[PDB]
């Protein structure tokens, strides 16, 4: 498939087009124990990009791209709506939360499995519920486009590598800023333990959130991990300290010299350590249609 057009001016501001580390004039040096080849630090409320490295460079997202199938689902599917599991859901590769034949799962439960344990089976199930893989990918990429994600083409809902798969640290920032503005999404990613339904002879179990930033970083709102052979380590994390809500995105990193979540902690530290109002660019606003919602009693 042909590559996506590169915009004539970097989206969010001219400064966001460069390689390497971009910071406001006079600012402190960026953390040196970050191995992410691309990253972003941004304000969730104002949309200000505080600092970045190759923010518009194109890289694979791995599992952090799950934000799009999650929001497509939250937007268009009823939370208590029951979805029947299939063997196809269980047949997907990678991490799974136990979605299978003979199982019934609410969209809500699938979303917790999707986001707390990166359940690829939950992703696949939601994709069928969005109308099967072709329709799901069309909706996911429509959502990406309507959020201004002009670097983003999604090959799979789960983040598994596929032809044409691409995103940027900026775009991922766009997607998670939008997602964190939805209380349903916010609640889920902040959730430490969740009762996941069993099925048939399979019993329910307590699902735990895999995200270490959530446990170890004070003020953390949570986040999302990822890794594939092509993407390397990816990570999104956010925190609220004294009303300042910062987000960091990491792409194409490694687990050296410190784990990805700890690299993220340092970038968040760096972000809080920059003066408020600092801005090298902005996360552009979603299409207006994405920011509002469109919705027995007869005389008898
Ligand atoms: C998403 O990236 C893949 C899956 N989701 C998760 C996850 O979020 O942790 C894993 S990646 C897991 C992270 N730590 C491992 C690692 O760093 N190495 C093996 C080097 C892998 C799943 C694989 C989804 C695309 O399948």
Residue numbers in the entry: 59 to 353, 360 to 364
From the paper:
Rv3330 was bound to meropenem, a beta-lactam antibiotic that was added prior to crystallization. The Rv2911opt-PMSF structure was determined at 2.0 Å resolution using multiwavelength anomalous dispersion of Se-labeled enzyme. This structure was used as the search model to determine the Rv3330-meropenem structure, also at 2.0 Å resolution. First, the alanine-like moiety within meropenem is hydrogen bonded to Thr283 through the carboxyl and to Ser176 through both the carboxyl and amide groups. This interaction mimics the contacts made by the D-alanine leaving group of the natural pentapeptide substrate. Third, the π-system of the distal carbamoyl moiety participates in a stacking interaction with the phenyl ring of Tyr284. Finally, the oxygen of the carbamoyl group is hydrogen bonded to Asn291 and Arg313, two residues outside of the canonical active site motifs that are nonetheless universally conserved among mycobacterial orthologs of Rv3330. In contrast, the distal end of this inhibitor, which is variable in carbapenems, points away from the stem peptide-binding site.
Here, we presented structural and phylogenetic analyses of two meropenem-sensitive Mtb penicillin-binding proteins, Rv2911 and Rv3330.
